[PDB]
């Protein structure tokens, strides 16, 4: 049935020859069972046990009964008739049974039968698959059809590992063919030698003279000529069977069937990655070629991994649809429409169809080739290639050079960094993450930064020990340089004096423990955040007064244990974020900077909060969370511009009613502390609401019911 | 099973005759095996090995036992009965098996069996395909279109794999010849030996030593029955001959390896059905022999016109209105444009969407614009690029009252359409492609005379001479543009006839000699002479004849000096003269006060002339890439400097007079060699970076509040 594909012309020929030979066996067997007799007539005159062969003719009277004649027939049939004439049909039937068993042994042996059935199934359902037609012919595919196509691909993938290792089917077919050919040789020897013994006239000399009276009888075998022509027909059929088996043996010898080359298939078709198959898989593929080569032509489609990549791309273009991706679109801190592609095989075309995209996140996309359809991403300005090597061509390169402006490349290898990122004209923001210190590549791969003249932001989370000179030549046009070294001292040597255009030097985790002179040598820095620079004593702040541009000096995450009075020189400061430190106290002279608008002192060791806070009339958010302030001074409430009061987790005994003076206060952190009760004057603040007033439920319930209702109504609306 | 459609009447008849022959073979075989005996009686009167054949009658005593009689029977049956009378049923069985093997070796040989199975599967799938019914009719579902396209590719691949050789036809021929030869041999030998099946047979076997008699006469009881069988068999073989012989004639009267679809292509709509050959032709001939409808409706899957119709229908369903609405963009005039790029046909869904205005169909072949475009409301532009358009008459009527502009790109006469002239209410007829073809010197455009509403006609076709038909048609023209892209036009002063013309343009004609027929026309307001490479314009003393020109456009020329007379035209409002070879330009050029747009980029001028200071109505200038280091106080006598182009230049000094110009719209200053940039770029919300692209090398040393204004430009 299903194995007709695996039976070539020689197998069909041998099967039909075996059927005809079995018919001969059955016919001869029935004849030899029913009508096989031996009519024997005694010789009247004998000479030394041999018939002498010595007025109308009269019959010879033998004086023998019918039963004596039957006895003579039985004795001479048993004794003198040759064994070949008696057992020709049974020997023929035995030979046909042996031939049929040899031909069908590999269809019944479970070890080869399992492989044969698996091969037949995964080649036939391969044959009727539509993916074969679509691939050999070379947008949208049916969901069931695509799932089936990938299922048969995986099934072929496991079948190749399950069969190619072994050669049991090939060896079994070899052994069956060899046994059949030697059986044919034995038959065509013995049958031809003994076929001449099927004679009509047989002399019998059986010595039954004491029971019959005669010794020699001239018998006659009736089915001798018919058995002779049956034997001749059987010999002819065995000759044909043997010639066919020798052709099969010669076919198996000349061409190595333990190898199969798809060279003809891979040249006619575009797919040239079809591998050369070997062993049993090669053998049954050769058999299928003997049946019909176009079956293997279609079967070679699933053997090429280029077809796998095409099918995976098409299925990804279907699995990720434009609709689901419209929901996938989110927004970042910069309020930019963005989609995060995590573990994707490539970029779906549905992703590139999107035109409102601002930030495309190619994160962990294995070796994806960027197609020119990125030109559809007209709004595309931000690409974050996170461990994603981007393969690109000329039109997509031109579109990115003319459109793309910010590029945050995160890599773990030099090869992960693409070389085309240095050819973009409009790039202005560039972020690197990953160690850059290497042999014969230290600050040489980025030598293409000179081509990039629009670069303004250069973040290097590269654990680098020194700033590269190419970045120093770039710094003529660079306005922002943030270095992250993760606790590695960067060798300054006052080498940052070249970047006179630098505006925001954010040394993140640089572990400098000192301020080099290059920080206050350049005149263009407004914001200098020495995050985790581990500066013990903040002593270089006198020279920062020449920095008229400096308005944001964030000295957080340091061992500053005391603030010298000298900071009173710097009157231009606004966003002094001095949090997460061990400041024993901020002094009165610290409040000499009346321009301070944003002041962060959270997670500090303050003794208290002084009165000169009344000087800072521009203060908006004062943050002393988890510091040591026992009582809130009224001078804190003297200022009216407070907006975000991070006062939680403190030892504030009580909040004075003077908070009712505050109107700009839209949020105040009051959770924890030693707060006895919340004053009713908190309801006087218009901008404050429930989300703004974060406090424990019981302390909030200490307020009168109606003012709480007012706050609730102002909150929900 | 499924091979009945491949078995004609001769094959069925031969199969049934073989069945009957097998039946008589089995019957005769059972008779011969069981009841075939030979009753032999001795001839007591022997006369030279012959039966002499010579008082109540009494039976003759032969003195023979029953076993002697059986021995005589066996010997005279073995030796003296004819071999035909003994082996007639076995020979008939062998012949029937040979005939059956010849008939079924077609379906048992794996190559031809696979080919026939593949053909049967494909033809049955096409028979049950619904599109063929529609193909015989002339909606469709997405699934039906998908499966019909897949069946089209399957049919193409099957034709490619089968039409290569004729193994099936050769096998059928060989089987037919073998059957005919077997019939001939069977008839000859059976007719010759049928007379040997006789009832009474005389046997002389020489068993006198065992029996006592020499000659015996035997009766073969079954012989007559075998004779009645044998003649019957002969009759069947006779039939099996003639039918088979007819097959041979049917296989030799006409070449079965060439199937002609002439009848099907002439009855059905599709007349492009190709004539298949070899095995395909043979199986299609056999299938016609079964039923012509199978091949008739299989012919639609071989015709390319059916594939084109199927692809058009699939484009109708594939291109949804939702996807089309995504493809609609907006052009310069804020008008909704659809860019149809590399579509094999034109979707009816394109004409479904009424929001379209500009229909750009580019390199779209086999175009037959359906009048469903009448349902489209906003269509005033249709952009035919490299397209052989064939519109319908109701669509002709609709576009005669609705379409208002038309751009045509083509390759000579091949893609020029004919319906464009029948539309006589259009305004804009833009022609692209080489109209300067061989042997068709302005004879195709001879049908433009009937157009009386045409007022805008842009001619960019590398014309050699002005067509006389254009002179005839122009009487109702208003706008004309001439682009030759590197060819010297032969005008020959034929513009004196055509007086109504308001706008005339001449781009890159390489003339150097401005013609005289312009001065007879007093209606030209906009004259464009870009890249004409003038060097001494003694024509603007002759342009004083023309008092209608409002803006001269002489930019990207090589003017050595501009002659002073143009200073007398106060109506001049636009001085486009950038990228020139100007060494010195005297003053009296600039006597005109009311010039708005000027461009002087990429020159060699050492100082901008003083009497530009007389120009008080400026909007744009340029000092790009030259040898000017300062802005003169004469330029400061002007008060309307909005735009400039001073980039990649050597300007050093920036006084407060130019800097206080708040309305500075777009001045190129990138790459300029300034010394320092002033703090006057700080406060005001009008003059900022997206307006003024000042030098970014000194924009770094500019104060951060200046940078605040400029980055505010990039935001606001
Ligand atoms: C001559 C018989 O001669 P004897 O009986 O020796 O005496 C001659 C007869 N006058 O035999 C022949 O000519 C052979 C021709 C018969 C061929 C028929 C073959 C039969 C094949 C059996 C197929 C079995 C399928 C079941």
């Amino acid at each position: 049935p299903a194995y007709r594909i695996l039976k070539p012309w020689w197998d069909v020929f041998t099967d039909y020859i075996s059927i005809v030979m079995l018919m001969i066996a059955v016919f001869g067997g029935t004849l030899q069972v029913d009508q096989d007799k031996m009519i024997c007539l005694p010789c009247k005159w004998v000479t030394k046990d041999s018939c002498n062969d010595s007025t109308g003719p009269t019959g010879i009277k033998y004086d023998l009964d019918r039963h004596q004649y039957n006895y003579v027939d039985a004795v001479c049939y048993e004794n003198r008739l040759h064994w070949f004439a008696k057992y020709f049909p049974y020997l023929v039937l035995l030979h046909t049974l042996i031939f049929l068993a040899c031909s069908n042994f590999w269809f019944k042996f479970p070890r080869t039968s399992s492989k044969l059935e698996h091969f037949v199934s995964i080649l036939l359902k391969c044959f009727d698959s539509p993916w074969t037609t679509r691939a050999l012919s070379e947008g949208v595919l049916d969901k069931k059809e695509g799932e089936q196509a990938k299922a048969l691909f995986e099934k072929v993938k496991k079948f190749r590992t399950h069969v190619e290792e072994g050669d049991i089917v090939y060896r079994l077919y070899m052994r069956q063919t060899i046994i059949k050919v030697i059986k044919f040789a034995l038959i065509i020897c013995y049958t031809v030698y003994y076929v001449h013994n099927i004679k009509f006239d047989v002399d019998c000399t059986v010595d039954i003279e004491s029971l019959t009276g005669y010794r020699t009888y001239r018998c006659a075998h009736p089915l001798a000529t018919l058995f002779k022509i049956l034997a001749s027909f059987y010999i002819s059929l065995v000759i044909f069977y043997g010639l066919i088996c020798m052709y099969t043996l010669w076919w198996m010898l000349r061409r190595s069937l333990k190898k199969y080359s798809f060279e003809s298939i891979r040249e006619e078709s575009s797919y040239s990655d079809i591998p050369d198959v070997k062993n049993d898989f090669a053998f049954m593929l050769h058999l299928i070629d003997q049946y019909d080569p176009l079956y293997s032509k279609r079967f070679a489609v699933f053997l090429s991994e280029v077809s796998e990549n095409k099918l995976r791309q098409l299925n990804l273009n279907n699995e990720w649809t434009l609709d689901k991706l419209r929901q996938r679109l989110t927004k970042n801190a910069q309020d930019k429409l963005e989609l995060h592609l995590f573990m994707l095989s490539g970029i779906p075309d549905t992703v590139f169809d999107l035109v409102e995209l601002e930030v495309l996140k190619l994160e962990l996309i294995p070796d994806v080739t960027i197609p020119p359809s990125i030109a559809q991403l007209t709004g595309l300005k931000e690409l974050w290639l996170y461990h994603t090597a981007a393969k690109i061509e000329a039109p997509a390169l031109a579109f990115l050079r003319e459109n793309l402006r910010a590029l945050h490349i995160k890599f773990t290898d030099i090869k992960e960094i693409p070389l085309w990122i240095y050819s973009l004209k409009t790039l202005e923001e560039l972020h690197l993450t990953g160690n850059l210190s290497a042999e014969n590549n230290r600050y040489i791969v980025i030598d293409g930064l000179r081509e990039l003249k629009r670069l303004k932001v250069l973040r290097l989370k590269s654990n680098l020990s020194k700033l590269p000179q190419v970045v120093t030549d770039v710094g003529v046009h660079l306005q922002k340089l943030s270095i992250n070294n993760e606790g590695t001292k960067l060798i300054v040597l006052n080498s940052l004096k070249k970047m006179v255009n630098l505006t925001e030097l954010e040394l993140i985790r640089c572990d400098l423990e000192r301020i080099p002179h290059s920080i206050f040598s350049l005149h263009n820095l407004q914001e200098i955040d020495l995050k985790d620079n581990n500066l013990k004593t903040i002593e270089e702040i006198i020279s920062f007064q020449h920095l008229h541009r400096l308005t944001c000096l964030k000295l957080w995450y340091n061992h500053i244990a005391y603030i010298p009075i000298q900071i009173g020189n710097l009157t231009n400061l606004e966003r002094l974020y001095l949090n997460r430190n061990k400041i024993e106290k901020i002094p009165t002279q610290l409040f000499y900077c009346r321009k301070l608008r944003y002041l962060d002192l959270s997670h500090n060791n303050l003794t208290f909060l002084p009165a000169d806070i009344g000087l800072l009339q521009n203060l908006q958010n004062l943050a002393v969370t988890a510091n040591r302030i026992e009582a809130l001074p009224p001078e804190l409430f003297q200022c009216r511009k407070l907006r975000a009061l991070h006062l939680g987790n403190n030892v504030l005994q009580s909040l004075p009613s003077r908070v009712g003076e505050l109107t700009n206060l839209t949020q105040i952190e009051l959770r924890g502390n030693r707060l006895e009760c919340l004053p009713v004057e908190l309801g006087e603040c218009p901008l404050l609401k429930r989300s703004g007033l974060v406090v424990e439920e019981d302390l909030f319930s200490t307020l009168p019911p109606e003012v709480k209702e007012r706050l609730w109504r102002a909150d929900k609306e």
Side-chain angles (χ1 to χ4, degrees), chain A:
Chain A
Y3 289 167
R4 92 191 299 288
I5 39 185
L6 274 176
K7 300 177 78 66
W9 71 265
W10 45 77
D11 270 47
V12 167
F13 272 38
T14 49
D15 168 7
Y16 280 118
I17 286 182
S18 290
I19 288 294
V20 182
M21 286 170 21
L22 194 60
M23 279 187 352
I24 293 179
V26 170
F27 179 65
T30 59
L31 260 54
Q32 202 261 2
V33 164
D34 313 354
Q35 307 104 9
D36 211 44
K37 316 184 313 305
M38 199 142 197
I39 294 106
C40 297
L41 269 198
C43 288
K44 201 73 145 65
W45 308 275
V46 300
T47 73
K48 305 301 175 301
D49 298 333
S50 181
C51 318
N52 197 201
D53 296 58
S54 61
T55 185
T58 325
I60 315 296
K61 293 172 160 298
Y62 287 136
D63 299 332
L64 286 190
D65 309 12
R66 186 184 178 274
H67 222 77
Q68 305 196 71
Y69 276 127
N70 289 355
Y71 189 86
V72 166
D73 292 7
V75 181
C76 300
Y77 183 95
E78 152 78 12
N79 274 97
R80 295 292 174 266
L81 165 57
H82 195 247
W83 61 269
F84 192 69
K86 303 160 62 175
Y87 307 115
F88 159 78
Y90 311 119
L91 279 166
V92 162
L93 191 137
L94 177 98
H95 290 322
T96 58
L97 280 207
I98 275 167
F99 277 149
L100 282 169
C102 287
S103 293
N104 309 11
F105 185 61
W106 70 321
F107 294 145
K108 302 300 182 173
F109 199 49
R111 182 177 170 184
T112 52
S113 185
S114 67
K115 300 187 166 189
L116 253 59
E117 191 46 289
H118 203 177
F119 180 77
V120 156
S121 43
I122 75 148
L123 167 38
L124 173 145
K125 74 153 61 73
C126 171
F127 184 70
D128 47 54
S129 75
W131 170 228
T132 41
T133 308
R134 145 178 289 280
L136 289 161
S137 81
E138 261 295 279
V140 278
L141 278 185
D142 173 43
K143 190 61 175 56
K144 294 302 177 181
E145 196 271 334
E147 295 302 320
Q148 283 150 3
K150 77 163 55 59
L152 290 93
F153 214 88
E154 304 318 298
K155 200 149 53 145
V156 173
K157 274 184 147 1
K158 45 202 61 183
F159 180 89
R160 195 193 174 192
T161 70
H162 147 64
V163 179
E164 161 198 319
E165 171 286 337
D167 46 355
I168 182 63
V169 177
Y170 170 70
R171 285 176 310 179
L172 206 57
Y173 199 83
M174 200 55 168
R175 274 140 184 72
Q176 289 168 183
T177 300
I178 292 178
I179 291 173
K180 276 151 74 174
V181 83
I182 66 182
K183 200 81 212 70
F184 145 75
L186 261 47
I187 292 166
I188 219 73
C189 293
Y190 101 92
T191 310
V192 159
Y193 183 74
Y194 287 118
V195 62
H196 82 278
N197 279 14
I198 315 186
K199 303 177 306 295
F200 178 76
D201 260 297
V202 202
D203 315 308
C204 94
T205 306
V206 277
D207 183 68
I208 42 181
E209 199 216 350
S210 52
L211 286 166
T212 290
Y214 311 93
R215 288 190 39 76
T216 84
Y217 316 84
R218 179 110 192 176
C219 302
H221 194 212
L223 301 111
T225 308
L226 204 144
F227 267 33
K228 207 149 46 189
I229 76 179
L230 276 176
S232 297
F233 195 25
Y234 176 70
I235 288 173
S236 180
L237 289 179
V238 170
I239 272 284
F240 285 167
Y241 202 105
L243 290 183
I244 293 166
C245 282
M246 299 215 78
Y247 178 83
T248 312
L249 200 54
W250 170 75
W251 174 73
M252 279 207 28
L253 301 203
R254 58 169 183 97
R255 50 196 312 182
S256 179
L257 293 191
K258 280 181 296 182
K259 88 189 190 71
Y260 186 42
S261 180
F262 276 115
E263 197 49 61
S264 300
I265 299 314
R266 80 173 52 106
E267 288 210 359
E268 159 278 359
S269 295
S270 178
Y271 310 119
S272 297
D273 61 310
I274 326 175
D276 280 359
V277 197
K278 64 179 180 180
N279 292 12
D280 264 345
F281 209 177
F283 170 65
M284 311 157 258
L285 279 173
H286 276 301
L287 282 190
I288 280 312
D289 280 8
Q290 293 305 312
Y291 178 76
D292 190 24
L294 163 153
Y295 273 90
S296 173
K297 204 129 170 303
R298 296 200 183 176
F299 186 98
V301 152
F302 291 108
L303 261 64
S304 87
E305 82 176 80
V306 159
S307 191
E308 178 166 31
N309 311 346
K310 294 181 181 301
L311 162 53
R312 283 202 323 267
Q313 266 292 330
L314 206 44
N315 175 67
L316 191 56
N317 301 338
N318 297 342
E319 172 199 357
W320 277 56
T321 183
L322 177 126
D323 299 352
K324 71 145 294 303
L325 184 74
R326 198 56 57 94
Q327 283 90 70
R328 190 61 177 89
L329 274 178
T330 54
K331 288 177 61 183
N332 53 14
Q334 225 170 350
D335 295 356
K336 294 180 164 183
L337 211 38
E338 58 179 15
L339 38 89
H340 194 291
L341 305 191
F342 225 176
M343 294 45 55
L344 286 186
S345 306
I347 329 166
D349 304 344
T350 50
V351 169
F352 273 16
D353 198 20
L354 259 56
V355 296
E356 65 277 342
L357 185 52
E358 181 34 10
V359 185
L360 154 58
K361 211 100 71 192
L362 294 176
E363 178 159 331
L364 288 167
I365 306 317
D367 297 355
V368 53
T369 306
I370 299 185
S373 51
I374 201 166
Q376 299 165 9
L377 290 152
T378 58
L380 211 68
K381 298 293 159 293
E382 252 193 76
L383 279 295
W384 295 339
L385 299 171
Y386 274 39
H387 307 116
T388 300
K391 301 294 128 289
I392 200 175
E393 69 276 319
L397 260 173
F399 183 79
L400 286 195
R401 287 177 288 234
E402 298 157 356
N403 273 247
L404 177 63
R405 58 174 311 210
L407 199 62
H408 288 194
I409 305 310
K410 182 173 181 182
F411 53 87
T412 44
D413 191 17
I414 312 170
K415 310 178 193 61
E416 294 189 19
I417 328 170
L419 291 203
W420 59 267
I421 84 161
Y422 314 85
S423 72
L424 303 175
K425 342 296 191 184
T426 49
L427 185 46
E428 43 76 35
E429 181 176 11
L430 188 172
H431 285 213
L432 292 203
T433 298
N435 194 24
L436 212 62
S437 296
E439 175 190 358
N440 297 346
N441 291 303
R442 191 183 189 184
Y443 316 141
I444 308 300
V445 200
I446 47 180
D447 286 353
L449 283 183
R450 290 305 305 271
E451 318 303 313
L452 181 43
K453 236 53 188 177
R454 303 317 218 172
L455 204 58
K456 279 150 158 120
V457 179
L458 201 43
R459 184 177 179 86
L460 319 174
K461 195 183 172 185
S462 302
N463 212 292
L464 62 80
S465 302
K466 74 153 181 83
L467 194 67
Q469 201 267 349
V470 52
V471 167
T472 74
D473 324 285
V474 167
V476 178
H477 43 273
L478 204 82
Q479 296 180 356
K480 170 161 156 46
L481 183 40
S482 184
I483 298 87
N484 194 354
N485 294 150
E486 301 89 52
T488 298
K489 143 77 178 181
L490 164 154
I491 309 177
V492 184
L493 229 51
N494 295 357
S495 69
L496 296 91
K497 295 183 173 180
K498 314 299 174 182
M499 32 210 61
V500 280
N501 267 23
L502 215 53
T503 66
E504 300 178 11
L505 176 66
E506 307 163 1
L507 294 164
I508 313 297
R509 302 182 58 186
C510 210
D511 263 8
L512 281 195
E513 296 121 341
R514 286 164 297 182
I515 307 175
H517 288 83
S518 45
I519 308 202
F520 39 91
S521 180
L522 306 170
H523 330 77
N524 273 333
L525 316 82
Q526 307 54 29
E527 312 166 21
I528 304 165
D529 301 358
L530 304 185
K531 155 43 181 63
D532 268 328
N533 277 22
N534 294 359
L535 320 167
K536 255 285 181 318
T537 48
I538 197 50
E539 303 301 318
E540 285 77 22
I541 72 190
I542 174 181
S543 299
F544 271 137
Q545 65 179 319
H546 326 63
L547 256 59
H548 314 288
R549 298 187 160 82
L550 176 53
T551 51
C552 184
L553 209 49
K554 292 191 178 186
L555 281 297
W556 52 4
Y557 290 104
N558 297 319
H559 329 74
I560 324 173
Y562 78 105
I563 312 169
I565 70 178
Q566 313 293 50
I567 165 169
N569 299 352
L570 266 167
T571 61
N572 222 337
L573 263 300
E574 304 159 1
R575 315 178 48 90
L576 166 58
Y577 281 27
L578 177 63
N579 49 297
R580 195 71 41 101
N581 299 335
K582 298 152 297 311
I583 288 306
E584 52 181 3
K585 61 179 180 181
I586 61 171
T588 69
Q589 307 81 327
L590 184 101
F591 308 104
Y592 283 0
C593 192
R594 293 61 61 81
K595 185 47 66 203
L596 288 172
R597 190 178 176 184
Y598 309 97
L599 214 67
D600 189 2
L601 290 310
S602 287
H603 283 187
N604 277 257
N605 306 351
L606 311 144
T607 314
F608 65 98
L609 186 169
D612 281 43
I613 194 72
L615 249 66
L616 316 186
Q617 204 32 271
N618 305 341
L619 178 58
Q620 284 207 134
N621 51 353
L622 152 62
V624 285
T625 289
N627 299 354
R628 275 292 76 68
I629 307 181
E630 288 276 345
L632 277 179
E635 293 88 30
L636 152 71
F637 307 101
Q638 269 284 5
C639 185
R640 298 300 197 273
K641 184 171 310 154
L642 295 73
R643 187 169 312 288
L645 257 194
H646 292 299
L647 301 203
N649 301 353
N650 206 332
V651 288
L652 310 195
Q653 301 140 347
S654 181
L655 151 63
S657 64
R658 280 303 86 189
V659 64
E661 290 169 337
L662 316 180
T663 300
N664 293 160
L665 189 72
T666 194
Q667 78 90 359
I668 169 173
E669 309 290 4
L670 282 202
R671 180 164 225 158
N673 329 296
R674 188 141 90 241
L675 272 193
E676 212 154 83
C677 271
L678 327 172
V680 200
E681 282 70 30
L682 280 164
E684 300 181 7
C685 318
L687 294 181
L688 185 60
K689 45 189 179 176
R690 183 69 198 114
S691 58
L693 192 185
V694 185
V695 84
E696 307 171 358
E697 182 55 44
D698 52 308
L699 303 178
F700 174 67
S701 76
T702 64
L703 286 173
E706 202 277 335
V707 47
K708 296 186 301 183
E709 177 262 348
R710 208 143 61 172
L711 178 145
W712 279 134
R713 181 182 60 200
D715 189 22
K716 46 183 53 180
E717 278 298 319

